[PDB]
Each structure stands twice: as structure tokens, then as C-alpha cells.
Design a binder for these strands. Structure first.
Ligand SMILES: [Zn+2]
Lengths: 944, 49, 244, 215
RNA sequence: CCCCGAGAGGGGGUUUUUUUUUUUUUUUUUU
């Protein structure tokens, strides 16, 4: 039945059955039918009179424009109501800035999308949440509204009821918006809806099939390319089958690896099996991508490479485990279900081979994805000539058994190839880097003052204390002589240093870090986006900030000549740089001068200035040398990878010069005190919060990583790396130097860096104390704290330190072991994506420098194989591959000795047998050429 | 125990990481065959009060 | 981490209610006249509770007899079919249940005038037929109604309510889904007053949010008192009309 | 595990084994338990099932709970060494037995007194290489023997019989019925069961009297 | 203080045994 309440509210019974672990549970929840559900339209003049405020006393905003996109009659002005299917298929088109401006998303739709896809639902909610003056999405709770709520008719499927529910919403919207002359358009691909309208017994409704609706828009030609779309693969199993298979030990799930060297062979990592199960064949891979979580079924033993009942399959499984131990034959399997696709928006370019210039109508073409481990996709398009030489974004729709290739439809036009705009943009979004400007909800969390924000003159002022009651805990260090040593064009300053000599002979060192925590608060959208990005990526081209410009370049940035809030760490240490005591405190400072690394070094060098500031700068340098020396004695590592800096001519936007950044003594000055700051903070926050302390560890490198390096060293150069301890590894790496070539030591260092374990963030409750060890720094504990503006990890550390000293209680989100695990796993992924995008940015610009230039540069052989060699050019910092065919003449006469890593061959321009060992300095002609298949600017090198 | 009982390890998933519970072998007693209990007959005492 | 919209940006909950609205609260008096001196059948949401008041009467054992006051006993029977998943074991001797029974007794010992019924016993039997969040608050309302039906003197009403705290937001009258997704506070309010007979917090709550949560609960409990009082006068009035 | 018993380690699992009309004779003994007022030993062997049960009567003893013109009787069945039955099933037979002996025991002779009758299902072997129905007539025989051995007044020697899941207890030379029990069985087989059980009732009664006299 | 006789009589104010524990959905620093 249905009961009417006092508020005009109704209530009914929503009952459904959910199957869990082979169980049947009857779930019953009560369903309240309201009468105060807003249409959320600017035109409406009735709803604002019946609307009520939210828990936070805030009435919802009517956002749907009073003058939407006007279309040719009889559509006129109109709102768009979406179906469940059109959302799941064309979410990319729903995010396109050039279409779908005013859209109504029914509750029943939002619910179905949430259950069918988690991710798409989030993207749809973001469109609703993120609405501006360009795009406007709402959620009309039709199930909760008594006016629109429909109930299942006798003998009616749930799919037809839901379609009738959406159709009822459109009718309600249509009748409700009649006085405002705004029609509603139902975008749906469903067959069922039309029959109910063809009769048109009760009311009229304008419905267009997704494709049919697009053909009614002014910009139909610009958005038609975004419309989602004996050979036969074996059908995937039904869902019930795989769930029972996993439970009965018949089927097994894991992540599949597909190498670019072989697309016809995959391997899955299974917990029950020691060695990864191979998957041989194209039917056996079954339309699986690299990184996909797949469910595999073990093939018969006769299918093994170098059954009926479930009992025999478990016996086959045991025989498979035995065969893996014997290492004679290795078990194979076939994927029969795809648990979780690794699919994401994909960047590629149209293949000129599959597009006919003579064709004027719609034609099928192929797009070559930038991922070399991925197949090509079929695309339906009419603008095949306009997308010919451009980086395009495409999204897959389906890959069925009866099609040799996956089918995809275009999403966006990034730009032309080898252009700074298109290549940088493609570079970022391929490494999952959000570069879009901060939304309005984000920018609203910023101070109301704006750029004219200022730290209070008096820290006891009634007004200032009234607004900030924590200001009394704020220390005053504006009398100190603070200076910042950062690169030339650095506007986002994180760290600031000072030094005084205490009357007791000891030194007072203070490291001051930007007080980002004071501006970004947990829960806000600003903090949300900050955590999402994890870190700001650094390119030669641009600079994608983690926080808004107003905050990171000014308010938080420790700029000179201005009063800025900061989290300060002050030490009292002797002349031998030994810490006597350490204090943490939130303070307010004023930077005396923002030096550059070259500018700071010259000031010290001159002897020109006796000023109290410069005298302090010299003192800091003296401490740093002592501090660095202690670390080296302790067992600190000294790895190296000084990447090149793409010089840009003032005269020409295009890059022409590639130089190298030199490490000045001021770089060692800043580095030593930043490390000192991070260490002291790490010790303090862990002492205060032993279970949720944001820390950073570095695993010790396995012996297997250096066994190959020591193999090449002991064979060719007759040397070795100890690996017994970090100090032992450092000492042996240090003596690893050739007198005939000084760069040999640098080459070994930059090569022994590749075999180091990746450092990761974590929380102190996830590991034990001995696991806090940082191998590369030889410290028992460590954390990131000095760069709040460009690292969210520091922000967490700042909040934890503030709670550690008693300045302000630590937020619950930083004391939840579960929430901390999510933060760490995110910033770890964002960190990797940051460096990879950064290195890719260097790769593009350097590749553009050598675009139309050939020069004999110095090269070093780092990898020796039978198919060719790999040489590294330190001048450009680019590794190149010289194939055997282009390496020498007569490939059948060349020989490769794995024992000596020697490759003997007869050069093309000669006839004398030359033996090319490893680590050899060779002359190499550089040349760049974009591959016609991968569209990636590679550097073809020819030795001499 | 059965030579090769089909029942092997049972996979249990955590929050991201995976683990496998060790295969439990079902021990079965013989319907007929039996061995006598090895009692230290030198130690068997009898009660009196 | 909840994938469901516990509190949507539209200010709507999973069941449709807003932040501040009680759940259908339907009371029923004199439901079991041949089984008890006083009886009440409570329906607060999907919650279904039978409450029986037997007494004041002679104690079954003279050993357990007070010559200055009546003996008040409460036994809560949470049936094995109260929740979607049937519980295999009984809850009769469960520590959680013993605490509930004890709690209820300690509540009404200071409300029921036991002093005017010396050398007697008041037995309160409760049967929970269905459970869906806020069962403690519903237990309080059931006893208060049943006791009044039995004509047993008491100083005032005792209304029970539960309030959840999802993030910052406070949710009145939470159900099973909401209780599983957030910390809740159970409040017993005496009459129209600000005085609490029962304050129950079993999960973590920030110290700053607790006062506001109490404020919401007290206001909501006052509405429960009004509904109980309303239905009681209605039942009274009809009886008076028909009897007189 | 339990703080009142020694049940051993919890990880231990019980040993489970694997694979690689007919005339009835019974033995009767009374008064071998000095601990109580009356006791009986009833052993029966037939086909692929033998049973050895012991009965013990404690009373008439004091009753705390209430005043009584007549006596009060309680019967409890206990599981024996190996064979086991559901507690519910043992309670059900106990109730069925209480009804029977409340028709036989001269309760009027024992005011404010309690007669507690215990029947131990000591050894019930099932050799077939609701089974409780075949044990019921032997229980009644044991309780009757024990009560008579105790010196508790009986209106008549109550005995019983079992036939195809049907159990019926007789008194007064089989003229009347003091209890009727039926599980499973067939349809319209009442008359056949009554005759077969009365034959067992007569045989049991003769052996009981022979035991109460000669022994 | 309480009940029954018209006058210092009588009758009542309320004691003792029974049965175990779970619990909800590629290092490092500044950028
Ligand atoms: Zn409206």
C-alpha cells in the first residue's frame, strides 16, 4: 500500500533480492514519496516557493538556463533528458564542451549507471557538480517525487518499468515547463520507448535516438564523430559460471601481461601457481588488453607449450603446478572472462592507408593508438580528411567474437603532430595528468581577500584573533634573516633558510616551509583536487600546478619583502653540525631576498658583502658540508642523473639549443638543510602519531639487480659493487672510475640508478620500525615536508606536525589507517606519473631540437645484443637503438659473445672486423625521424 | 588420506592484496585395521585408599 | 567509503527523507488485553515491537520481595527473524541484551512510582518482531506506552530517538543502512524537558559535534512525545465517549 | 573450551570411519543400585539391534515447590556411551512416559512427595551394518520394574509393544490403553499393530512378574 | 501503628537453593 504523511510526504515499500555467496536475501527498504522536488530550472516560478534548505541551511541552486540551446522547430528551446544506455555509451560526448549544455538526469538513470559502471557514474556526477555557464547537469529525483513515481504493473519487466519511469519524467518536465516555452528531448537508443509514443494515448513526448538527436543540432557535423558504436571468438562465460569457477578452484583471476615483442602470447600471474601461466594464441587471449584483470581456464595438458568434470580440472591444476616445478613443460590457459578492463581514453592517429580521399560519404578507417602494446581500432567518420594528420582521442565501444578488431568512436581533436600544443597535451593525458583549470567549486575555497591577502601586523589583534583563534600559537620570526634559494624563474617558493650564531657558541639553523595547511582544509573541493593530483608535474613547456595559482604562486609562496605564514623548524647545533635540540613551530616570516642558485653562489664568492644576511648564508654553507660529510660517513648514497635542459631562444619559440644544468655549491646547501628538516619532522610526527604518520621509505636493492651490472664490470673493466651495505655500495661505485675517460664513472652511476628499488610513501602503521629505513639516504626514518605547495604529502606532514606540537588537533582523516592507505597509494601513483610526464616532456623538446639536424656526438654503449646495440648520448640525454641491419654489412658474419658482451661486425663503410665491447666511447651520428606507425619522434643513430 | 583430493587451497582476498589458505587434508580412519595403544606397562599403577 | 548516496547534495536520503523528519510513527494501545494489564504495539519505520506489562502483582517467590517498592523487571526478546539474515543462535543471554534490559530498568525506576506499589512486581515483556535501526529508541517508546495503558503511575513520558552523524551532517531517526555507515547517538528525553534519561554513544564521535547531535535528538524526541501523547488522547477520548 | 569439563584441544576433530516377523529375547534384573530406592536392568537382543538400558527411581522425596495432596512424577532419559539421540526426542519420550505412569502410579499415597525416575540409555548398538520407537517398550518395562522394586504402588503392571513404528502400552490384561505412539508406518494398519503389540505386552508382563517374584 | 469486646482481655503486621560462552550488511634536492 501507500501511506500519506503530514508533510505531504508519502511512503511505500521497495523490495528486491540480492544474491551473495550463493545466498538469496530478500532486502526490503522503505521508500518515501515527497512533493517538494525542485525542477532546478531558472525559468521555473513555482519550485522556489516549495523548496527547503539542506542540513547546512542552504537552499539548492536552480542552474538550468532560462534560455537553453534553441533548435529548429518544433524543438525550439529545449532541455535534454538522458536514458541509461546513452550515458554508458557516450559519456565522452556528454563531456564535450560543444554539445549537451542543459541536461536532466533522472534518479533512476543515475542509479542504473552507478550499478552498471562505477566510473561513469562518477564522471556523470562531476558534470552535475561541476556545472558552469557552459555546461549544466542536474539530477531530478523522480523516484522520490510522488508526481513522477511509477510502480511495476502486473506482468511487466523491470527494464520496461524504468523506461516508463524516465518517460514519465519527461512528460512531467514537459507539462511543467509549458508556460516557459521549453520543450524536452528524450535521447534514447531503446526500441521499446517509441511504441508507447507512437500510440501517444496519454501525452506527447519528443524522443530522438542518440544518432537521430545529434542530427538535429546546429553543430551536428562537429559532434557526429563522437557517437559510440569463418572468424569468431569463443563467447565469454556467463557471470554465474565464473563466480562458481573461482569458488570451486576451476577458474583463476589475475592481471595479464602482453609484451610489444609478441602480441600472440600473454601471461597471467596466479596466486596458486609459482610461475606465470602462459596464454598462447589469439582466440585464447580473447580480446584481452595488457594490464586487464582476466579470468582464465587451464587448457588440457596436450595443449602445453615450451577434461569434463570439476574434479579433473582440479587434478589438471595440480599437474600444472608440478609441471611448473619441473621446468620442462609449461602449462597454458585461455581467458574466458574479463573482470576489470584497463580501458581509458586512448590517444592515437588515423592510418593514411585506410582512408580514401575520393570518398565523400561516411567511411571506415583505422586509428593507430600511441600504446605500442595495443591493437588498432575501427572508426566511423566523415571528416576523415580533417583528422588525417592530427592527434585524436578515441574510446572503445565493443569487441565481439565476430570482429577481428575492436570498434571505437572519436572523442576529441588534440591537434597536429610534432607541434608543441598537440604533443604536450597528448603527453600529459597519456600519463593520466589532469591539466584542466580548477573548477569554480575549487576556487571558492580560496580566501575572500584574493591577491591582497596579508598576514596580520599584530598577532594579538582582537579582529585577527577573532577570525583566527590559533594565531596565538603562531610564533614571530619576522626579525630573522630569511632568504630563499631557488631556480631563476621560480615563483612557487616552498623553502626558506636562515642562520644565526647563539651566544653559547652554537648555531641556530631555521628551515621555513610554506604553510599550505592554513589554506587547504580537509573536506573541501580544494583539498579534494589537491589529493587527486598528488603532485604538480614539471615540463619545459608548461607547469601543471597541484594548487591554484593564487595560492601556490603568492599566498603560500614564501616571496621576499612580504609577511608570509610558514611552518618553521629550528635547530640548535654545534660547529660539527650535531643536533643538540630541535623545535617545531608555526610562524610568520618575511623573506629578505629570493636568490637564484647562481646569484646566491656569487654573493658568497665575492667577499664583497659583510652584511648580516650574507654572513648567515656563508654559515649555512659551512654547516651543509659538515652535514653532507656525516651522511657520507654514515652510508649515504651518491647516485646521479643530471638530465639536460632544453634552452629556448628568446628570438624563436621553437627550441634550438640543448645544454646541461650544473650543480653549484648552493644546490648542496639547500639539499642538506631540506633533508635535515624532513628528518627532524619525521621523528617528531612519528613520535606523536606512531600509527598514522605520513612517511617515506626506500627498499634495499635486491642482489639480482646488480648481478648483471657486476657481470659486465668484472668481465670488461674487472670491477665490482659490494652490495653489502649502502656505504659499501657507495665506496665501490666511487672507485669505479676510468682514467682515460672521466665520464665513465658518471655512466656507471646513471646506470646503477636504474637498478634501484622505487621509494614509496606510506603510513607508520603499515610497517614495522626497521622497515622505515631509507637505503639511498641511510636514515632510519624520513618524510616529505618541505614542499607543501607542489606536494600533497607535505601537506599531510604539516597537519601532523601541527598536531604534534599542539598547535591544532589533527584531522580524523589523517588518523584513519584506511584513509591514510588511500592517500599513500594515490600520491605514489601521481608521483610516478609526474616524473614520467616530466621525462617525456624533455624527450619531445630534445627530439624537436634534433628534428632537422645531424651532428657527430659522443656516445656510450650501454646495452649489447645480437640484434644490435644501444648507445647513450650524454649531450642530448637520449638513448638510441642501432639495429644490426643498419649497424654493419653482412649480418650473417657478425657474432655476439654474451660472456664478454662483445659484438663483432664489419662496418658498412669498411671491411675490417671491429669488436665493439660495452662501456665504449664511440662516435655517433644523430638523426631524428618520426615512425610512420607509432608516430613517435625516435632518434635513429648511426655509429662511426 | 586420499592420494590426490581435488580440494586444494582456498583463495581469500584482502583490501588489494591476495592470500591463500592452506589446503586442509581430510584424515580418514580405517574401518577395520587398527594398532594397539603403546602403554608404559611399568608405570600403570592401581588405586587404593 | 560508501558508494551509496547516504546524503545527496539535494538533501535527500536513501529512503527519501530529509535530515530532520521522523519515520512513520504509528502507536497502538491495548493490543493484548487478555495477556497483560498493559500492552502496546509499536511501528516506528520497519521496526515492529510488542510490549507487555504484567502487574503490579504478587511475586512468584517471597524471597524476591521489597516492602518499600515494587520490583521492576524487563526482558527483551529480539527474535531470530528480526533482521534480513536470520540469526542461528538466540540472544536471550547475550551480554548486549542483558545491558539493554538493565538499561531500560534503570530508566523507568526513576520514572515509575514504584514506591506506591510495595510488595508487588511489575514484569515487562518485549518482543521485537522486526528490526531496522533505532531499535533502542523504539524500545523506550514501547515501554512508556504500555506502562501508561496499565494505569501504572509515572512522573512523565520518556521518548527515545536515534541520531546519526554522517560527516558533518546530522541525520534524525536513522535506519539500519545509515547506522552501518556512520556513528549514531541514542537519546532518551524525559517529557518536554532537556533532561536525558538515557545517553548512548557506542561509536566514535568528535567532541565538537556531540552537543549539536544532542540538540537534534532532543528536538526529535519531543515530536515523538507529541505523537505518543496524541495517539493516547485519541484512544482515551473514544473510550470515554463510548463508556460514558 | 568448557571450564567445567576436559574436552581436550579445539583443533582436534573426531575420528570418522570409511569403507574399504522376528522373535525377541530380553534379560531382566532389579535392585542392583544401592544409591536409589529402585532400579532395573533391561537388555534386549534381536536381529541387527541390541539394547541395554538402566532405570533408577529416586523417591518419594521432599518437594520444595508446592503443597500436594498426591505425588509428583518426573522422568528423564539420558544418552548412553556411543549411540546418541536428539535432546528434543528424549524429552518427547519422557513426556510420553510421564503420561503413561501418571495412569499407573497410585499418586494418592504420596502427598507432597516427588518420584524422580531416571532411564539411562547405556548401550544401544545398531548393527544394520526415528530409531527411538523401538526403545520405548523397553523403557516402560524398566520403569515398571524399577517402581515395583522401589515399592511404589502401581494399579497394574504396565507393559508395551512395538510394530512398524507404532508403540502402544497396555494395562488390565490388554483390555485398555495407557499410551499410544505412532511414527512413519503405513495406512490403516492400526488393528494389526494393536494385536502385535499386545503379544509383546503379554510376553513382557509375564517376564516382569517372573522377575519381581523369583529373583 | 492494625482488627474484635465498652473500660487495662484477646487476635494479627508478612525470611531462605536448581541448568556455560559468539552476536548485524629508476635514489635525492630545488623547480
Ligand atoms: Zn519547477
Amino acid at each position: 500500500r501507500r501511506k500519506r504523511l503530514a508533510d505531504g510526504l508519502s511512503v511505500t515499500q521497495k523490495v528486491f533480492v540480492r544474491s551473495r555467496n550463493g545466498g538469496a536475501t530478500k532486502i526490503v527498504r522503505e521508500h518515501y514519496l515527497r512533493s517538494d522536488i525542485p525542477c532546478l530550472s531558472r525559468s521555473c516560478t513555482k519550485c522556489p516557493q516549495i523548496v527547503v534548505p539542506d542540513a547546512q541551511n542552504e537552499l539548492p541552486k536552480f542552474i538550468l538556463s532560462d534560455s537553453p540551446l534553441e533548435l529548429s522547430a518544433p524543438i525550439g528551446k529545449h532541455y535534454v533528458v538522458l536514458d541509461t544506455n546513452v550515458v554508458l555509451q557516450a559519456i565522452d560526448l556528454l563531456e564535450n564542451p560543444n554539445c549537451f549544455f542543459d541536461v536532466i538526469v533522472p534518479q533512476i538513470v543515475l542509479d542504473e549507471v552507478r550499478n552498471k559502471s562505477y566510473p561513469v557514474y562518477t564522471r556523470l556526477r562531476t558534470l552535475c557538480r561541476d556545472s558552469d555557464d557552459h555546461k549544466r547537469f542536474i539530477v531530478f529525483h523522480n523516484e522520490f517525487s510522488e508526481h513522477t513515481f511509477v510502480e511495476r504493473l502486473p506482468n511487466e519487466t523491470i527494464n520496461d518499468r524504468n523506461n516508463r519511469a524516465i518517460r514519465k519524467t519527461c512528460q512531467w518536465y514537459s507539462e511543467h515547463l509549458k508556460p516557459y516555452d521549453i520543450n524536452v528531448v528524450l535521447v534514447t537508443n531503446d526500441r521499446l520507448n517509441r511504441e508507447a509514443a507512437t500510440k501517444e494515448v496519454e501525452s506527447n513526448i519528443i524522443t530522438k535516438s542518440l544518432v537521430q538527436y545529434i542530427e538535429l543540432l546546429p553543430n551536428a557535423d562537429d559532434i557526429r564523430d563522437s557517437i559510440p558504436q569463418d572468424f569468431t571468438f569463443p563467447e565469454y562465460y556467463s557471470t554465474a559460471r565464473v563466480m562458481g569457477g573461482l569458488k570451486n578452484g576451476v577458474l583463476y583471476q589475475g592481471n595479464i601481461q602482453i609484451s610489444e615483442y609478441n602480441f600472440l602470447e600473454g601471461s597471467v600471474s596466479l596466486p596458486r601457481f609459482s610461475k606465470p601461466v602462459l596464454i598462447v594464441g589469439q582466440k585464447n587471449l580473447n580480446r584481452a588488453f595488457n594490464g586487464d584483470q582476466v579470468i582464465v581456464e587451464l587448457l588440457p595438458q596436450s595443449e602445453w607449450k615450451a577434461v569434463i568434470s570439476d574434479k579433473q580440472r582440479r587434478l589438471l591444476a595440480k599437474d600444472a603446478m608440478i609441471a611448473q616445478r619441473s621446468k620442462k613443460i609449461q602449462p597454458t590457459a585461455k581467458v574466458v572472462y574479463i573482470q576489470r578492463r584497463s580501458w581509458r581514453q586512448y590517444v592515437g592517429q588515423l592510418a593514411p592507408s585506410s582512408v580514401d580521399p575520393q570518398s565523400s560519404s561516411t567511411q571506415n578507417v583505422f586509428v593507430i593508438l600511441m600504446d605500442k602494446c595495443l591493437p588498432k581500432v575501427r572508426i566511423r567518420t566523415r571528416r576523415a580528411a580533417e583528422l588525417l594528420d592530427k592527434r585524436i582521442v578515441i574510446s572503445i565501444d565493443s569487441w565481439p567474437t565476430t570482429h577481428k578488431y575492436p570498434l571505437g568512436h572519436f572523442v576529441r581533436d588534440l591537434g597536429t603532430i610534432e607541434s608543441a600544443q598537440a604533443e604536450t597535451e597528448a603527453l600529459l593525458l597519456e600519463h593520466d595528468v589532469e591539466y584542466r583549470p580548477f573548477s569554480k567549486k575549487v576556487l571558492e575555497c580560496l580566501p575572500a581577500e584574493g591577491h591582497d591577502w596579508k598576514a596580520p601586523t599584530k598577532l594579538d589583534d582582537p579582529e585577527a584573533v577573532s577570525k583566527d583563534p590559533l594565531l596565538t600559537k603562531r610564533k614571530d620570526l619576522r626579525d630573522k634573516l630569511i632568504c630563499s634559494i631557488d631556480p631563476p624563474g621560480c615563483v612557487d617558493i616552498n623553502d626558506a633558510l636562515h642562520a644565526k650564531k647563539l651566544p653559547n657558541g652554537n648555531w641556530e639553523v631555521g628551515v621555513h616551509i610554506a604553510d599550505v595547511t592554513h589554506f587547504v582544509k580537509p573536506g573541501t573541493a580544494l583539498d579534494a583536487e589537491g589529493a587527486a593530483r598528488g603532485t604538480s608535474v614539471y615540463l619545459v613547456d608548461k607547469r601543471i600546478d597541484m594548487l591554484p595559482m593564487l595560492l601556490g604562486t603568492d599566498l603560500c609562496s614564501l616571496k621576499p619583502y612580504v609577511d608570509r605564514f610558514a611552518f618553521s623548524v629550528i635547530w640548535e647545533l654545534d660547529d660539527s653540525a650535531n643536533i643538540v635540540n630541535v623545535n617545531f613551530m608555526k610562524s610568520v616570516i618575511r623573506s629578505r631576498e629570493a636568490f637564484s642558485y647562481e646569484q646566491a653562489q656569487l654573493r658568497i664568492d665575492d667577499k664583497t658583502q659583510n652584511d648580516e644576511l650574507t654572513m648567515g648564508m656563508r654559515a649555512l654553507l659551512k654547516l651543509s658540508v659538515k652535514l653532507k660529510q656525516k651522511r657520507l660517513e654514515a652510508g649515504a648514497l651518491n647516485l646521479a642523473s643530471p638530465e639536460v635542459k632544453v634552452h629556448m631562444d628568446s628570438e624563436t619559440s621553437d627550441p634550438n639549443e640543448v645544454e646541461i644544468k650544473k650543480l653549484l655549491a648552493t644546490n648542496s646547501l639547500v639539499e642538506e638543510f631540506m633533508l635535515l628538516a624532513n628528518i627532524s619532522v619525521a621523528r617528531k610526527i612519528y613520535d606523536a602519531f606512531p600509527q598514522t604518520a605520513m612517511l617515506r621509505r626506500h627498499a634495499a636493492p635486491p642482489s639480482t639487480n646488480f648481478e648483471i651490472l657486476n657481470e659486465m664490470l668484472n668481465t670488461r673493466k674487472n670491477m665490482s659493487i659490494s652490495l653489502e651495505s649502502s656505504k659499501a655500495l657507495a665506496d665501490s661505485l666511487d672507485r669505479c672510475v676510468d682514467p682515460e675517460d672521466p665520464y665513465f664513472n658518471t655512466l656507471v652511476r646513471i646506470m646503477s640508478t636504474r637498478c634501484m628499488m622505487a621509494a614509496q610513501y606510506f603510513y607508520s602503521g603499515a610497517y614495522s620500525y626497521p622497515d622505515f629505513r631509507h637505503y639511498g639516504l641511510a636514515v632510519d626514518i624520513y618524510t616529505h615536508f618541505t614542499s607543501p605547495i607542489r606536494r600533497y604529502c607535505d601537506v599531510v606532514a604539516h597537519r601532523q606536525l601541527a598536531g604534534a606540537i599542539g598547535y591544532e588537533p589533527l584531522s580524523l582523516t589523517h588518523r584513519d589507517k584506511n584513509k591514510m592507505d588511500m592517500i599513500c597509494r594515490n600520491i605514489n601513483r601521481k608521483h610516478r606519473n609526474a616524473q614520467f610526464a616530466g621525462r617525456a616532456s624533455i624527450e619531445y623538446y630534445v627530439g624537436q631540437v634534433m628534428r632537422n639536424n645531424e651532428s657527430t656526438e659522443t656516445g656510450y654503449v650501454i646495452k649489447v645484443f645480437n640484434n644490435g646495440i644501444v648507445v647513450l648520448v650524454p649531450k642530448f640525454g637520449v638513448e638510441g637503438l642501432i639495429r644490426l641491419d643498419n649497424l654493419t654489412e653482412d649480418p650473417n658474419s657478425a657474432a655476439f659473445d654474451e660472456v664478454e658482451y662483445k659484438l663483432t661486425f664489419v662496418p658498412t663503410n669498411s671491411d675490417k672486423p671491429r669488436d665493439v665491447y660495452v662501456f665504449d666511447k664511440v662516435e655517433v651520428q644523430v638523426r631524428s625521424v618520426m615512425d610512420p606507425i607509432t608516430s613517435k619522434r625516435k632518434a635513429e643513430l648511426l655509429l662511426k | 588420506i586420499d592420494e590426490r583430493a581435488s580440494d586444494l587451497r582456498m583463495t581469500i582476498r584482502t583490501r588489494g592484496r591476495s592470500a591463500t589458505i592452506r589446503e586442509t587434508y581430510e584424515i580418514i580412519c580405517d574401518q577395520t585395521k587398527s594398532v594397539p595403544l603403546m602403554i608404559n606397562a611399568k608405570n600403570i599403577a592401581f588405586a587404593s585408599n | 567509503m560508501s558508494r551509496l548516496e547516504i546524503y545527496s547534495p539535494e538533501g535527500l536520503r536513501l529512503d527519501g527523507r530529509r535530515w530532520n523528519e521522523l519515520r512513520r510513527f504509528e502507536s497502538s494501545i491495548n493490543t493484548h488485553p487478555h495477556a497483560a494489564d498493559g500492552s502496546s504495539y509499536m511501528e516506528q519505520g520497519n521496526n515492529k515491537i510488542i510490549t507487555l506489562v504484567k502487574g503490579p502483582k504478587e511475586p512468584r517467590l517471597k524471597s524476591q520481595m521489597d516492602t518499600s517498592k515494587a520490583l521492576l523487571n524487563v526482558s527483551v526478546n529480539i527474535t531470530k527473524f528480526s533482521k534480513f539474515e536470520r540469526s542461528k543462535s538466540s540472544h536471550k543471554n547475550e551480554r548486549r541484551v542483558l545491558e539493554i534490559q538493565t538499561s531500560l530498568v534503570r530508566m523507568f525506576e526513576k520514572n515509575v512510582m514504584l514506591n506506591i506499589y510495595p510488595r508487588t512486581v511489575i514484569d515487562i515483556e518485549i518482543h521485537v518482531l522486526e528490526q531496522d535501526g533505532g531499535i533502542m529508541g523504539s524500545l523506550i517508546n514501547g515501554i512508556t506506552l504500555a506502562l501508561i495503558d496499565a494505569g501504572i503511575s509515572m512522573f512523565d513520558y520518556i521518548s527515545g530517538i536515534s541520531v546519526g552523524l554522517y560527516d558533518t551532517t546530522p541525520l534524525l531517526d536513522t535506519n539500519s543502512l545509515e547506522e552501518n555507515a556512520m556513528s549514531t547517538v541514542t537519546l532518551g528525553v524525559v517529557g518536554k524537558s532537556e533532561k536525558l534519561s538515557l545517553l548512548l554513544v557506542e561509536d566514535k564521535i568528535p567532541l565538537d559535534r556531540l552537543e549539536n547531535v544532542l540538540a537534534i535528538g532532543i528536538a526529535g524526541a519531543h515530536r515523538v512525545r507529541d505523537l505518543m501523547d496524541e495517539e493516547l488522547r485519541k484512544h482515551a477520548q473514544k473510550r470515554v465517549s463510548n463508556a460514558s | 573450551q568448557d571450564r567445567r569439563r576436559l574436552l581436550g584441544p579445539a583443533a582436534a576433530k573426531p575420528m570418522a570411519f570409511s569403507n574399504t516377523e522376528s522373535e525377541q529375547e530380553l534379560s531382566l534384573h532389579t535392585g542392583f543400585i544401592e544409591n536409589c530406592n529402585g532400579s532395573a536392568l533391561v537388555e534386549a537382543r534381536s536381529l541387527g539391534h541390541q539394547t541395554s538400558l538402566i532405570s533408577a527411581v529416586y523417591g518419594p522425596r521432599s518437594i520444595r515447590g508446592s503443597f500436594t495432596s498426591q505425588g509428583t512424577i518426573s522422568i528423564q532419559l539420558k544418552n548412553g556411551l556411543l549411540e546418541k539421540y536428539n535432546t528434543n526426542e528424549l524429552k518427547e519420550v519422557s513426556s510420553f512416559l510421564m503420561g503413561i505412569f501418571n495412569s499407573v502410579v497410585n499418586l494418592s499415597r504420596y502427598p507432597k512427595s516427588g518420584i524422580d525416575i531416571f532411564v539411562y540409555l547405556t548401550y544401544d548398538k545398531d548393527l544394520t551394518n526415528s530409531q527411538i520407537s523401538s526403545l520405548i517398550p523397553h523403557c516402560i518395562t524398566s520403569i515398571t520394574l524399577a517402581l515395583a522394586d522401589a515399592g511404589i504402588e502401581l494399579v497394574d503392571m504396565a507393559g508395551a509393544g512395538e510394530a512398524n513404528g507404532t508403540v502402544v502400552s497396555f494395562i488390565k490384561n490388554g483390555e485398555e490403553i495407557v499410551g499410544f505412539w505412532k511414527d512413519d508406518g503405513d495406512d490403516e494398519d492400526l488393528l494389526e499393530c494393536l494385536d502385535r503389540c499386545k503379544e509383546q505386552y503379554n510376553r513382557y508382563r509375564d517376564l516382569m512378574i517372573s522377575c519381581l517374584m523369583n529373583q
